[PDB]
């Protein structure tokens, strides 16, 4: 019927009202993900920045502790080496003590 056709046209107009709300919310939907992807890349950039920031902070100080451990070990062997030199002289000092102790006893015995 003619009225039914014009009714169908009214439906098509209603759809012209709907589909416009459709096609567009997709545009509002499509931008919503643009916002997420724009955010994601910025996070994995801060990630690579933090991980990169700490890793180098470790590498740079772990090089100072190593240069300290070497510099430490360097004198720890020098102390021992000088610990000997201290004993060598001590061996002579106390040996110089027994001589004047008994050089005495004989000029005494005299």
Partner 1 sequence: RHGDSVRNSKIEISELNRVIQRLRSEIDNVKKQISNLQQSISDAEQRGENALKDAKNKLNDLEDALQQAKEDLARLLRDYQELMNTKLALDLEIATYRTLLEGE
Q: What is the DSSP string of 24-85?
A: HHHHHHHHHHHHHHHHHHHHHHHHHHHHHHHHHHHHHHHHHHHHHHHHHHHHHHHHHHHHHH
| Interacting residues with its own copies between 43 and 72 (CB under 8 A) | 48-49, 51-53, 55-56, 59
The CB-of-39 to its own copies minimum distance in angstroms stands at 19
- Rounded CA-CA distance 103/96 in Å is 11
Rule CB under 8 A: is residue 75 a binding residue for its own copies? no
Interface mask (CB under 8 A) for partner 1, residues 39-58, using x and -? xx--xx-xx--xx--xx-xx
Point out which residues bind its own copies (CB under 8 A). 48-49, 51-53, 55-56, 59
């Amino acid at each position: 019927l003619t009225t039914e056709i014009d009714n169908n046209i009214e439906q098509i107009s209603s759809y012209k009202s709907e589909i416009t709300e459709l096609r567009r919310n997709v545009q509002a939907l499509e931008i919503e993900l643009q916002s997420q992807l724009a955010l994601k890349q910025s996070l994995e950039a801060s990630l690579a920045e933090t991980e990169g920031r700490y890793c180098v902070q470790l590498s740079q100080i772990q090089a100072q502790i190593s240069a300290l451990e070497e510099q430490l070990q360097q004198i720890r062997a020098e102390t021992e080496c000088q610990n000997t030199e201290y004993q060598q002289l001590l061996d002579i000092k106390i040996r110089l003590e027994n001589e004047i102790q008994t050089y005495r006893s004989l000029l005494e015995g005299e």
